[PDB]
Assembly symmetry: C2
Homo-oligomer: 148 residues x 2
């Protein structure tokens, strides 16, 4: 898709596909930054990821939506979020804008549960600071929409 | 999960989903590096991200397999791959291998047409060198397997 055309921060129905039986799997482009104009930090995006899916599962992931997974994009310009169900751009965003407020509520590293050799893949690649700025940005800038 | 006991390269199974209608979703931890011992290049996982995902599906997904999203983790030591269906370790540990050799089928960056600023949200960030790097290292170590 034309990354020059799209804007950020903005939800976007990334792809839609059905299950063999009946259930629905929707996949969202949770694009934080403006394609090639800005970029997420390998540490920020990482400490963030932890918190994001812990919180998006709180505001979103209710009873008629199911979260499979939320993980950062290689291009570190936002996360991809596959889920069981099919919310719309409003519903996700509202869930995203909330979460960021949830992230802010974490003053230090010992609050991030995983963050250790025994449970986090790469213990020293965490920046709660960078991951808070992002929240601030997003929360500040507002989460619009990007339709295909 | 105790990362310390984990082995890489190796396919681990991190999640299976039961959707109301029946069909089961599967999420696979694809671990390239030993956590906190070895890790992936930021510019390289991206590069390896446009490759892998495609090639994979060209050796996987069928009359019972459908991949939703192959995406890099934050820690940067592995790769989660969600799909509708239920293929096991050997069936993922094998096409990742078919998927790895093809990385080395990649001649140069001038083989990635998606490397435009209208299709890549971070086309600058790129390293087919480290693709091949990571690649040849995987095809030498042979993918193993981990059991939660
Ligand atoms: Hg940004
Ligand atoms: Hg590695
Ligand atoms: Zn981690
Ligand atoms: Zn890209």
């Amino acid at each position: 898709v034309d990354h020059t055309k799209m804007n950020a921060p903005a939800v976007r129905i990334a792809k839609t596909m059905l299950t063999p039986k009946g259930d629905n799997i929707t996949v969202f482009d949770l694009r934080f930054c403006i394609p090639n104009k800005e970029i997420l930090s390998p540490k920020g995006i990482h400490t963030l990821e932890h918190l994001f899916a812990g919180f998006m599962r709180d505001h979103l992931n209710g009873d008629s939506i199911e979260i499979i997974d939320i993980s950062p994009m290689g291009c570190r310009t936002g996360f991809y979020m596959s889920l069981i169900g099919t919310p719309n751009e409003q519903k996700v965003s509202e869930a995203w804008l909330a979460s960021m407020q949830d992230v802010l509520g974490v003053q230090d590293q010992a609050s991030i549960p995983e963050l250790n050799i025994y449970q986090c893949g790469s213990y020293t690649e965490h920046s709660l600071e960078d991951a808070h700025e992002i929240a601030k940005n997003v929360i500040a800038r507002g989460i619009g929409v990007n339709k295909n």
